[PDB]
Design a protein around this ligand. Sequence first.
Ligand SMILES: CCCCCCCCCCCCCCCCCC(=O)OC[C@H](COP(=O)(O)O[C@@H]1[C@H](O)[C@H](O)[C@@H](O)[C@H](O)[C@H]1O)OC(=O)CCCCCCCCCCCCCCCCC
Ligand SMILES: CCCCCCCC/C=C/CCCCCCCC(=O)O[C@@H](COC(=O)CCCCCCCCCCCCCCC)COP(=O)([O-])OCC[N+](C)(C)C
Ligand SMILES: CCCCCCCC/C=C/CCCCCCCC(=O)O[C@@H](COC(=O)CCCCCCCCCCCCCCC)COP(=O)([O-])OCC[N+](C)(C)C
Ligand SMILES: CCCCCCCC/C=C\CCCCCCCC(=O)O[C@@H](COC(=O)CCCCCCCCCCCCCCC)COP(=O)([O-])OCC[N+](C)(C)C
Ligand SMILES: CCCCCCCC/C=C\CCCCCCCC(=O)O[C@@H](COC(=O)CCCCCCCCCCCCCCC)COP(=O)([O-])OCC[N+](C)(C)C
Ligand SMILES: CCCCCCCC/C=C\CCCCCCCC(=O)O[C@@H](COC(=O)CCCCCCCCCCCCCCC)COP(=O)([O-])OCC[N+](C)(C)C
Ligand SMILES: CCCCCCCC/C=C\CCCCCCCC(=O)O[C@@H](COC(=O)CCCCCCCCCCCCCCC)COP(=O)([O-])OCC[N+](C)(C)C
Ligand SMILES: CCCCCCCC/C=C\CCCCCCCC(=O)O[C@@H](COC(=O)CCCCCCCCCCCCCCC)COP(=O)([O-])OCC[N+](C)(C)C
Ligand SMILES: CCCCCCCC/C=C\CCCCCCCC(=O)O[C@@H](COC(=O)CCCCCCCCCCCCCCC)COP(=O)([O-])OCC[N+](C)(C)C
Ligand SMILES: CCCCCCCC/C=C\CCCCCCCC(=O)O[C@@H](COC(=O)CCCCCCCCCCCCCCC)COP(=O)([O-])OCC[N+](C)(C)C
Ligand SMILES: CCCCCCCC/C=C\CCCCCCCC(=O)O[C@@H](COC(=O)CCCCCCCCCCCCCCC)COP(=O)([O-])OCC[N+](C)(C)C
Ligand SMILES: CCCCCCCC/C=C\CCCCCCCC(=O)O[C@@H](COC(=O)CCCCCCCCCCCCCCC)COP(=O)([O-])OCC[N+](C)(C)C
Lengths: 523, 113, 214
Amino acid sequence: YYKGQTALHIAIERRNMALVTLLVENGADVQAAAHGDFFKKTKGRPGFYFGELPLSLAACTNQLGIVKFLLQNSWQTADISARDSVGNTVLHALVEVADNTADNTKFVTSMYNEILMLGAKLHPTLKLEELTNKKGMTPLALAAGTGKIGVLAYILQREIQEPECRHLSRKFTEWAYGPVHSSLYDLSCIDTCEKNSVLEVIAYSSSETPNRHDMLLVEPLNRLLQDKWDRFVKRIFYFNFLVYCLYMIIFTMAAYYRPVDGLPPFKMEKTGDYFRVTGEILSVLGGVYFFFRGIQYFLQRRPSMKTLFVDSYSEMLFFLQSLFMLATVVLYFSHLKEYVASMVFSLALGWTNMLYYTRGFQQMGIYAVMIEKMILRDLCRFMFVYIVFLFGFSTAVVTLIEDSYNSLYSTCLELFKFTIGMGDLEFTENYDFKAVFIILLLAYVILTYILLLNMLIALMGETVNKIAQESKNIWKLQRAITILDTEKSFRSGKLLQVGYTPDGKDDYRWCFRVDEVNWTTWN
Amino acid sequence: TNMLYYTRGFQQMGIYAVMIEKMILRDLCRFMFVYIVFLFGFSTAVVTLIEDSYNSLYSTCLELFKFTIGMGDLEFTENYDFKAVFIILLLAYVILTYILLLNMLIALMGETV
Amino acid sequence: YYKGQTALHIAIERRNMALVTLLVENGADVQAAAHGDFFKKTKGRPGFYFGELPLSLAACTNQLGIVKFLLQNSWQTADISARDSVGNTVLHALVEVADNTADNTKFVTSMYNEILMLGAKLHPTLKLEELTNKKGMTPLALAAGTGKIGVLAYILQREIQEPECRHLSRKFTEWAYGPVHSSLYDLSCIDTCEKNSVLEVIAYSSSETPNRHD
Ligand SMILES: CCCCCCCCCCCCCCCCCC(=O)OC[C@H](COP(=O)(O)O[C@@H]1[C@H](O)[C@H](O)[C@@H](O)[C@H](O)[C@H]1O)OC(=O)CCCCCCCCCCCCCCCCC
Ligand SMILES: CCCCCCCC/C=C/CCCCCCCC(=O)O[C@@H](COC(=O)CCCCCCCCCCCCCCC)COP(=O)([O-])OCC[N+](C)(C)C
Ligand SMILES: CCCCCCCC/C=C/CCCCCCCC(=O)O[C@@H](COC(=O)CCCCCCCCCCCCCCC)COP(=O)([O-])OCC[N+](C)(C)C
Ligand SMILES: CCCCCCCC/C=C\CCCCCCCC(=O)O[C@@H](COC(=O)CCCCCCCCCCCCCCC)COP(=O)([O-])OCC[N+](C)(C)C
Ligand SMILES: CCCCCCCC/C=C\CCCCCCCC(=O)O[C@@H](COC(=O)CCCCCCCCCCCCCCC)COP(=O)([O-])OCC[N+](C)(C)C
Ligand SMILES: CCCCCCCC/C=C\CCCCCCCC(=O)O[C@@H](COC(=O)CCCCCCCCCCCCCCC)COP(=O)([O-])OCC[N+](C)(C)C
Ligand SMILES: CCCCCCCC/C=C\CCCCCCCC(=O)O[C@@H](COC(=O)CCCCCCCCCCCCCCC)COP(=O)([O-])OCC[N+](C)(C)C
Ligand SMILES: CCCCCCCC/C=C\CCCCCCCC(=O)O[C@@H](COC(=O)CCCCCCCCCCCCCCC)COP(=O)([O-])OCC[N+](C)(C)C
Ligand SMILES: CCCCCCCC/C=C\CCCCCCCC(=O)O[C@@H](COC(=O)CCCCCCCCCCCCCCC)COP(=O)([O-])OCC[N+](C)(C)C
Ligand SMILES: CCCCCCCC/C=C\CCCCCCCC(=O)O[C@@H](COC(=O)CCCCCCCCCCCCCCC)COP(=O)([O-])OCC[N+](C)(C)C
Ligand SMILES: CCCCCCCC/C=C\CCCCCCCC(=O)O[C@@H](COC(=O)CCCCCCCCCCCCCCC)COP(=O)([O-])OCC[N+](C)(C)C
Ligand SMILES: CCCCCCCC/C=C\CCCCCCCC(=O)O[C@@H](COC(=O)CCCCCCCCCCCCCCC)COP(=O)([O-])OCC[N+](C)(C)C
């Protein structure tokens, strides 16, 4: 629990820089391995993780005066990389500790700056940040995966104004003509990475992973995806939308002009049945595509059990459409007319799934997201209570009905008509007590139609006030996944020379030119 | 309808005519795209299921425009083969268009104002 | 791209008022014609437009101490009208540079005031603002067409309290009886103009033309 904890960790955590000097002189190392349960991540534990090592403790402790000592001393030669039981360095661990609190953000980014410079002052034989833990995650990708927008904003916009420590900048200003100043944001492992690009870790994040939808508003990401969109994804996406529209046009007439005379599999006799069979072939193949394209989404991401049903909603409804399609093949060869039952569900899913492709458009794509955030937030709450009432008063009505509205379906059906403006208050005279029948419908009308539908409109109006910004930020991620999937299924930015590493060479960098214009920054 | 031009000589009415513009384009265009996707989506799905004169894409698209104006019969055909399909598919239509998307329009149309 | 750019434009843009003094003494004119693609409007170009002329550069640069020098010197006699490849003067160009940012609004209107007075101190044989570019647009109509509400608010409400420079005011207070004070806003080329009244350029503006409705 307190395993590995030396007296030097006491000298640090108690904010006593004097004894940390003395304790290492006695032999007690500064590479001490606090592999204790208290000293690992919480995961249901009241503990604190800092990096398993003294240097990592002081960095995560509001202790800068100490951290410089753990390196600059003659007694011990504490390695600055110095991984732990999980591979995390001081820089990794210094991302594990961030909480997105503003007071924590200002602190971690200040400290995170200082160890980098110190890691360059002593020996440049590094690339600190290109080290990975035992999840194969750099601190950059670790702040993106763990949802640490504050650190991510720093690492991307990192500019250090001094000669030796500018190679570790990743925001280079190239030219300026007064108010105009032009940056050269580095793209190394934001879009092109071997392991865990920033974009492949924001967009493809698990649903919790906080601030999934804010991590892209971090400049240059909103601006780089819009470059990929305007350049080589707007053309492909609108071609994906074409083929899907044509596919739906083709699966629709092959469904509209289906046979009605016999059993399946029907047989080709006339010319017009050769045009539909292709319409049926070209229909099913897309259902193999959206099937395999859906299986891949559950084998090249392998999202958890929860992450089938909390954030993958579109990918489900194209896969689900494919299941109703590949149930429509099994039952068109099983000699069964229930393929139609599956086939109309495929159409209904299919056309509704145009509401996917309207994410290539801002005001329409935000609209498609509000629809999501109403189906789940306002319509689920509604349709639970509405079914309680509907089935509540239905039973109460069909109970009262005797001796064919003496049925629970038609009563639940006739009471669904009050809500669509088609309720007869006289759909039965087959009862024994009229005040009961009508007090019980007026109770239904008042509670469901007058109150609860109109209440839905109110809920549904309080939601729009809230998700106006969130749904734009959910829209840009949906377009991001569209950009990234297009890439995996064109290199952005040019290979500019920005400066020089502190060993003599040209620091070649793939960089994204941005052009801002201020009027108080005359320098 | 072009009287709604000349009501710009009046403040509270002329502002009203401008809100009408900024709803036709902002809220009703977004609505009537998605509404036609659903309408034509579920219509095809219904007239597919219909056999042997509601075996038509017009009248089905027409009868499904009646759920939104409060005139939708959930029994405008018995000419089908599967009733759960016909009614799950209309309730899907009603819930998505009438209960959700019209009432959502009112919400959008209220955030605009 | 950098065409026409002299070493004097360097001495200005680098905010060095000392070398601008020396460089004109060597013959390098202060009517220099920076007809370069970088020095024209963006229209899909990462450039900066200032007015194609040094006097126009410093006016659009957070440089007032320099602008008075480009006129008040014995070595060269920089014309204050001094049109460019598109006809814009310092006053026109000083509207092209406005962005409606509040920090830019306070700046351009302060500077836009100063060249007018200086344009009156040296020689009144002008009507600076009644000069037009090659679109037939004065700086007034150019701030209305280009959507520059901050400059437009200045030019219309322009009142300068001093004897010689009040003819360039266009907001004259006539009478006052304590709390009551009565203005006389000038209407010359707001409603009655030969070319491009302010109202005929706000209302009849293209749809982008920002702040049409403000
Ligand atoms: C026999 C089987 C019986 C059935 C049960 C089996 C399980 C059901 C399937 C599981 C799924 C259930 C879905 C329930 C309905 C709601 C769906 C909906 O709001 O999804 C919006 C979605 C948005 O994008 P995405 O999801 O990509 O974005 C996500 C998302 O934003 C996330 O928050 C962010 O992390 C991030 O942005 C990104 O990760 O976009 C679309 O889904 C495309 C548009 C599709 C239309 C959306 C409208 C709703 C249609 C529902 C009804 C279908 C049509 C009628 C069918 C009739 C009967 C057959
Ligand atoms: C997907 C979500 C639901 C959408 C649908 C929404 C609609 C409402 C929900 C409908 C769902 C339930 C449908 C009925 C289930 C089978 C029994 C049945 O049909 O009737 C039984 C009758 O007696 C009853 O129905 C009362 C017993 C309760 C059954 C339902 C469980 C309660 C939860 C669910 C209820 C919701 C409560 C609120 C929920 C929080 C048996 O009789 P019968 O089969 O009719 O046989 C003919 C009898 N005859 C010979 C006399 C003619
Ligand atoms: C102004 C905006 C629209 C307003 C109207 C809104 C209403 C909905 C929109 C209606 C617009 C389309 C109307 C149909 C076009 C002609 C084909 C036709 O009539 O039916 C064809 C059938 O098969 C089909 O209709 C399926 C093929 C798709 C056709 C439409 C293209 C998809 C986009 C548009 C669709 C929207 C999708 C969502 C949009 C994002 C051919 O058959 P028929 O001609 O009937 O011939 C009689 C056949 N009989 C002998 C068997 C009896
Ligand atoms: C094709 C979509 C293009 C999209 C753009 C246009 C926008 C869409 C807008 C408007 C729609 C306009 C067309 C409406 C149809 C009327 C004409 C017609 O087909 O009549 C025939 C019906 O046809 C069928 O039964 C064929 C059904 C499947 C067709 C799908 C294409 C086939 C695959 C290849 C496609 C090419 C792939 C390349 C695509 C680039 C008449 O025959 P029938 O006597 O009714 O007999 C039918 C069977 N029955 C016995 C059951 C009755
Ligand atoms: C080989 C037959 C040739 C003839 C076919 C005739 C065409 C008839 C149509 C459709 C019939 C074609 C077969 C079914 C396709 C299923 C739909 C599909 O895949 O959609 C995908 C297209 O992405 C593709 O890669 C599609 C395949 C390439 C297009 C080739 C045909 C287009 C020809 C015509 C070209 C235009 C010129 C015509 C006039 C305008 C959609 O993109 P996605 O990335 O999958 O995103 C959705 C999935 N997600 C939500 C889970 C992310
Ligand atoms: C077979 C034929 C299939 C149809 C052709 C399809 C292929 C060609 C498709 C698309 C090419 C481009 C279409 C025009 C877009 C205009 C832009 C616009 O107004 O955008 C605005 C609204 O969004 C819309 O207006 C889009 C409306 C829905 C999609 C286009 C209608 C046609 C498809 C319907 C019929 C489907 C059913 C089948 C029909 C038969 C949003 O603004 P923005 O523009 O995003 O502004 C930039 C903001 N941003 C940079 C932050 C993002
Ligand atoms: C037989 C017996 C049947 C019983 C009755 C059957 C009723 C069936 C229906 C609804 C059942 C009741 C569900 C109540 C949910 C409460 C709202 C909620 O949590 O909203 C959250 C949605 O995010 C989610 O993850 C919840 C999604 C709920 C189900 C989604 C499927 C709906 C598909 C379509 C089907 C709909 C039409 C149904 C057609 C019939 C958002 O909430 P929030 O404001 O953000 O706060 C929570 C924050 N949080 C997200 C971080 C947690
Ligand atoms: C919100 C808190 C939850 C409350 C839930 C409990 C509430 C329950 C309340 C009341 C319970 C009892 C009501 C029914 C009477 C008993 C049955 C009976 O014999 O009926 C008979 C007595 O004849 C009548 O006319 C009906 C009696 C008057 C009912 C109206 C007053 C109550 C309405 C206020 C309702 C509550 C308001 C609440 C406001 C907050 C019916 O006969 P008829 O119809 O005259 O003749 C048949 C006609 N025929 C021949 C044409 C066929
Ligand atoms: C959040 C809580 C939710 C609510 C929970 C609690 C429930 C709240 C809900 C409903 C409760 C309130 C309504 C009570 C209904 C009584 C029914 C009754 O008795 O019918 C009997 C009327 O009997 C008569 O004697 C009629 C003459 C009296 C006039 C009644 C007023 C009209 C009622 C209308 C109400 C509609 C408006 C409702 C607007 C509110 C039937 O007998 P009859 O033979 O038909 O009539 C006599 C002969 N005659 C026709 C010649 C006259
Ligand atoms: C053939 C006969 C044709 C009719 C005669 C037409 C000619 C005579 C027409 C108009 C003369 C004046 C009418 C009264 C105006 C009252 C002012 C008022 O209340 O204004 C308010 C509401 O706006 C309205 O009340 C206006 C309502 C619509 C127009 C007038 C109704 C008659 C035309 C309908 C029938 C058409 C169909 C044909 C009918 C046969 C607004 O406030 P304000 O007043 O603006 O306040 C000042 C604010 N401001 C300074 C910022 C702006
Ligand atoms: C939102 C995400 C998208 C989901 C889309 C996919 C959803 C698709 C769901 C389901 C797909 C399958 C449904 C139909 C059954 C197959 C066809 C068949 O044989 O039907 C028969 C089986 O008899 C029945 O009674 C129907 C079976 C029960 C259906 C109700 C449960 C599902 C409702 C929940 C719906 C989803 C809730 C979603 C909540 C989130 C019909 O026979 P009948 O009617 O009994 O007899 C005929 C009557 N007659 C003789 C008078 C003529
Ligand atoms: C965002 C996502 C959007 C949604 C997407 C997913 C879709 C969501 C939408 C709809 C899905 C939920 C509804 C399922 C409908 C089933 C239809 C069916 O099976 O019909 C069969 C009923 O078969 C029976 O067995 C009836 C007895 C069971 C009671 C059923 C409850 C009432 C359903 C009412 C529902 C209305 C209320 C709906 C309120 C929600 C028909 O057979 P029958 O011969 O007529 O009946 C048997 C004999 N009897 C009459 C003597 C009893």
